[PDB]
Design goal:
monomer, alpha+beta, P-30 Protein, lyase activity, 3 helices, 4-stranded antiparallel β-sheet
Length: 124
């Protein structure tokens, strides 16, 4: 079973690399993180930072969620992220993605005790 915090780590965290390792990164990671099992998830973002830096975002700038409610928070610093977006010829079960490297502020929704990131809302 996965708690919401554990699913956020599976869907959005990859501190094992400092940036997407090559143009094939989303094609491999979308499958290995199990995001393409039942359908091709069309967009997903991965965060290449320590989890401790991402959990601290929960006490930073409060903003409304784009979806949720207003329990979203935007990071003060920019972070190393990868955007994975399904390409035109992708079709389940052969999901294919374009990998884009970016350095942007992240916005996450946080919940619980301890109060941690449970959803990736957006990047700006």
């Amino acid at each position: 079973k996965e708690t919401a915090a554990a699913k956020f780590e599976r869907q959005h965290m990859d501190s094992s690399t400092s940036a997407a390792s090559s143009s094939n990164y989303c094609n491999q990671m979308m499958k290995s993180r199990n995001l393409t099992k039942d359908r091709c998830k069309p967009v997903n973002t991965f965060v290449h930072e320590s989890l401790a830096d991402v959990q601290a975002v929960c006490s930073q700038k409060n903003v409304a969620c784009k979806x949720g409610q207003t329990n979203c928070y935007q990071s003060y610093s920019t972070m190393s992220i990868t955007d994975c977006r399904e390409t035109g010829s992708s079709k389940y079960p052969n999901c294919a993605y374009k990998t884009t490297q970016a350095n942007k502020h992240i916005i996450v929704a946080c919940e619980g005790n301890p109060y941690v990131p449970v959803h990736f809302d957006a990047s700006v």
